[PDB]
Coordinates of C-alpha atoms (C1' of nucleotides) in Angstrom, one line a residue:
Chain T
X407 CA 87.4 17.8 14.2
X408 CA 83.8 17.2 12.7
X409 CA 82.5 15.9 16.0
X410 CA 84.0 18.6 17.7
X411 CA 82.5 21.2 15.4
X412 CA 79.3 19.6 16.7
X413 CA 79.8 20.0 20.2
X414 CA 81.5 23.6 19.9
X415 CA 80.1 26.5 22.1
X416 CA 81.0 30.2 21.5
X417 CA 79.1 31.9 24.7
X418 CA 82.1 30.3 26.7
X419 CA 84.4 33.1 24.9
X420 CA 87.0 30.8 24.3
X421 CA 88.9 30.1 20.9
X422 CA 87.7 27.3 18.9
X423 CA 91.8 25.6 18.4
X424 CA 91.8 24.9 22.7
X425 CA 88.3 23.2 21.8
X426 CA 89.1 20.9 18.8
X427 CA 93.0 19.7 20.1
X428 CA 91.4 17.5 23.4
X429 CA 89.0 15.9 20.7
X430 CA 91.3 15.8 17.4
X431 CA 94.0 14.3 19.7
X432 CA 91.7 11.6 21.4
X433 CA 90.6 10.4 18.6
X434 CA 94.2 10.1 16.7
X435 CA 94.9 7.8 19.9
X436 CA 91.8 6.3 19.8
X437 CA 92.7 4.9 16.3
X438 CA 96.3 4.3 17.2
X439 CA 95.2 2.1 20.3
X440 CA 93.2 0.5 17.9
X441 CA 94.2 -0.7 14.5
X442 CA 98.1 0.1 14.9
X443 CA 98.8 -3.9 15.6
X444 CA 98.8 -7.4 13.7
X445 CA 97.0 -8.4 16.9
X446 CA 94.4 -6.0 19.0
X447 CA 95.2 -4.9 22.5
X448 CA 92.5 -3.4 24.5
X449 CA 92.8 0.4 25.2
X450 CA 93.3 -0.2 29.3
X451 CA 96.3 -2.7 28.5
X452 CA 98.0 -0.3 26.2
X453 CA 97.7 2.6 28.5
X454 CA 99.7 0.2 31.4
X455 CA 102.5 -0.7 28.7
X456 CA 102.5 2.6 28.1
Chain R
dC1 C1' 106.0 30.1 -59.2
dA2 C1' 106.5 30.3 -54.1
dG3 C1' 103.6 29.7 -49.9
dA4 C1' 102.2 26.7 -45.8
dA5 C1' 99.2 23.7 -44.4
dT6 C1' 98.0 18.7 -42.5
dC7 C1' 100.1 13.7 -43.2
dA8 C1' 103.7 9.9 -42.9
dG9 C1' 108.5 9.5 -42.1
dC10 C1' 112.1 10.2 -39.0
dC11 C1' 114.2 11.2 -34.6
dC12 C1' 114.7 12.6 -29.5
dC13 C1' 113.1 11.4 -25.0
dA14 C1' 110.8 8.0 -21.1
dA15 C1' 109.4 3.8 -19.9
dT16 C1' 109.6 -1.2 -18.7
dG17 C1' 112.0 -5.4 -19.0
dT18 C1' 116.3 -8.8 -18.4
dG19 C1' 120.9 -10.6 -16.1
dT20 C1' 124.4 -18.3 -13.0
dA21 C1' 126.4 -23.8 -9.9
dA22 C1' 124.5 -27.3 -4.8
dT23 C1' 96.8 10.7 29.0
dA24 C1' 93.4 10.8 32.3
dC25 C1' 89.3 9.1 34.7
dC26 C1' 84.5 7.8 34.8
dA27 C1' 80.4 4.5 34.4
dG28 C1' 77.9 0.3 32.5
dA29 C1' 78.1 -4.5 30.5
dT30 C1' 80.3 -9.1 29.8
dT31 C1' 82.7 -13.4 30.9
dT32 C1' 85.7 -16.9 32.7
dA33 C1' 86.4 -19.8 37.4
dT34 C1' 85.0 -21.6 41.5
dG35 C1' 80.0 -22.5 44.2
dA36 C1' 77.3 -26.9 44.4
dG37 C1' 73.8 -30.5 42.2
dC38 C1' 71.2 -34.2 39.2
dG39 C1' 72.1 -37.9 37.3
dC40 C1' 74.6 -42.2 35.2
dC41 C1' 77.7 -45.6 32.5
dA42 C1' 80.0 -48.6 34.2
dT43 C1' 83.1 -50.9 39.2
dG44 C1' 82.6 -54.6 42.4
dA45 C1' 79.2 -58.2 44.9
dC46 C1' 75.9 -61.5 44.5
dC47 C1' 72.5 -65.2 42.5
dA48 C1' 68.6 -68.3 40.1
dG49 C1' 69.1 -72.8 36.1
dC50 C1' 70.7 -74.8 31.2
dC51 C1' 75.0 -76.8 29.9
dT52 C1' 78.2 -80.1 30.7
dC53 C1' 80.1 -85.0 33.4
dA54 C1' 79.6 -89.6 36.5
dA55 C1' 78.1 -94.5 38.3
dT56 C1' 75.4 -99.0 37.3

DNA sequence: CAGAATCAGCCCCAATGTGTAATACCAGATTTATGAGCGCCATGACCAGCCTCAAT
């Protein structure tokens, strides 16, 4: 959300919620992909398992 | 003389401690595997006498 806030635009009339969700939720998988596991898997080779 | 205040004595409530036998894509950077190559310790082939025997 923070680094969202730093990238936000109002001219582009849109509400700031649509905005932050893409970023809040890339980052939550972004840490999941990450340091969810005893043993790190790269973010390509979880997207195929997934 | 009765009053209630601020201290120990007493009591109710909480707490811990015990309990046995064999998503998606995008771009930029990195690395392991096959490319050959220099270079060599050690395989197989000689090759000179000092070391080890014989007859007179």
């Amino acid at each position: 959300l923070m680094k969202a806030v730093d990238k936000f635009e109002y001219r582009r009339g849109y509400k700031f919620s649509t905005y932050a969700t893409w970023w809040i939720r890339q980052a939550i998988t972004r840490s999941i992909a990450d340091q969810a596991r005893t043993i790190r898997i790269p973010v390509h080779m979880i997207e195929t398992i997934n």
